[PDB]
Design goal:
part of a larger assembly; 4 chains; 173 residues; mainly alpha; Ferritin; 5 helices; 0% strand; binds gold 3+ ion; metal binding protein; iron storage; light chain apoferritin; Iron
Chain lengths: 173, 173, 173, 173
């Protein structure tokens, strides 16, 4: 093969697509982060939050690529589509966008799981379970918690609420 | 006995009942804590507050059980009734529920004191005085202080106030 | 949801039931422990053994509750039924009761696995596999080993055997 | 007085009697200890156990005497009657004698409590509660536990059982 064993072409292709989705997510977080770094937005904790996520998504893509080679599949790259927005609105708007994005990654993981199970590829299933599935669940829970707190704050009064959330919940210098 | 001395059947039974009340209190705090851990509630400091109290009430029950055996009484366990609510409302609602619960434990301690005094059981009285009575008074004072602060904050505006109390008064990561 | 994804109502309910089973197990171990602390039983190592298990079962329940919220399910609590006995007999009687209890928890885990697999919920399966299944297998093996040793000892002569097992196998001060 | 306040002659006398009882207990433990040091008895752990108790009872007497002077009472000493036996039999015989002795001290403490309460002497009650009542309860519990273990062992077979208890339960070099 010289190493490929029990690794379907279907899974190989799906893994390449998942790499693209993770890299696109990383790119979206890069855009989110720099938006919050604008002098007319200026929420450092929010920038920091999304910058860390950009790194996390890139790391996920890299782990997938490492696994592709470990199994004897061939990494193939496609264009990275630009993020869906150029401007990201308020903190709740951005957190909602983030949750939508993570749910889409999670669904792709679940779809790849289903394919792995169909193809009887337990190494793939173990890989997703060990490095991806719980990471996504934890992240989405954190995002939901954040969204609840931001919504509670901006419903009281928006400017003040956004400031307090960035200062008191998010990590900043 | 071989060890039982000056330990009435009345006190023995009352101690078993008090164990049940402390364990039920622990269970109520477990429910309170996880309620505040919900993604649609998301007040970590409040969860932490009640989680610590769950541990404290369990420890109280365990001390009572240790004492039961020290005196040569027989520990007897009954069902632990589920907590009185499945959902606990707002931070002030939960703090009020907590104060009601602690006052009920305190009254049970006082009732056991009265029984001890009636039965001329100074070891029991010393035990309650040394490990329970002041702990309850201190806890109830803290709860009252908390309730006053939360009420002051949510009367200004509720969402904002609940967030600020959780961030600035309660212990969180 | 705002976070719930691929999490069936069937699994949500089963998780609540499993929390109840773990808490009931914890309660049974609390009773076992204090029984061995009786002055007319007086086997400290046995008390210590069951006290540690009470903590372990409570921790299991708490992990399940954390997961319930991570997935966006709603924790619901029911009564904790009192343990099945008030007095627990000899060390072998108690160890047998413990094995029966652990096998019942293990079967509940396996049943939840089956449900997870039926519902195509790999996060649930990963969770059970990572935090529960091997813990149960290890514990049951230890219990079986203990039971074999106690049986070997009490068949030689009971009082002496029970003492030696508590002194030389079990952890004590 | 120049210092005596709220300290009845009844309590003063009872305290002197209690000093005598504690010193007599100390003397009994001295005899118990040296009995187990006999070459034809030779149970070092048992000797050590009773030697420590002799010290504890003497310390109790000394605390009582200190309190007598703190309150402005006059310490008065009487003969210390020799212990009730010259030879103390087997380990269970000795442990039974010890429990009888401690129960008698505990009853004397309780009687002094009753007198204190009758005389409205809260300093006396606090003193007994803080330094004596729980110490006695703890000691008697330990003795009961010991007796249960020794009885379990000597009912299997006496010589072997006595050796094992001294080696594996009691503190020795
Ligand atoms: Au940035
Ligand atoms: Au920045
Ligand atoms: Au930044
Ligand atoms: Au799979
Ligand atoms: Au598979
Ligand atoms: Au956020
Ligand atoms: Au909590
Ligand atoms: Au929490
Ligand atoms: Au918490
Ligand atoms: Au009292
Ligand atoms: Au009293
Ligand atoms: Au509070
Ligand atoms: Au125990
Ligand atoms: Au114990
Ligand atoms: Au123990
Ligand atoms: Au499964
Ligand atoms: Au599954
Ligand atoms: Au065992
Ligand atoms: Au000696
Ligand atoms: Au010696
Ligand atoms: Au010695
Ligand atoms: Au008194
Ligand atoms: Au008094
Ligand atoms: Au002894």
């Amino acid at each position: 093969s010289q190493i490929r064993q029990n690794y379907s072409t279907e899974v190989e292709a799906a893994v390449n697509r998942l790499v693209n989705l993770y890299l696109r997510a990383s790119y979206t977080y890069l855009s989110l982060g720099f938006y919050f770094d604008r002098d007319d937005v200026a929420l450092e904790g929010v920038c920091h939050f999304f910058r860390e996520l950009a790194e996390e998504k890139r790391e996920g893509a890299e782990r997938l690529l490492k696994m592709q080679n470990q199994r004897g599949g061939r990494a193939l790259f496609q264009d990275l589509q630009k993020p869906s927005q150029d401007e990201w609105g308020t903190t709740p708007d951005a957190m909602k966008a983030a949750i939508v994005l993570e749910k889409s990654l999670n669904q792709a993981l679940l779809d790849l799981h289903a394919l792995g199970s169909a193809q009887a590829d337990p190494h793939l299933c173990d890989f997703l379970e060990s490095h991806f599935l719980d990471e996504e669940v934890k992240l989405i829970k954190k995002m939901g918690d954040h969204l609840t707190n931001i919504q509670r704050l901006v419903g009281s009064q928006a400017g003040l609420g956004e400031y307090l959330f960035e200062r008191l919940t998010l990590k900043h210098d």
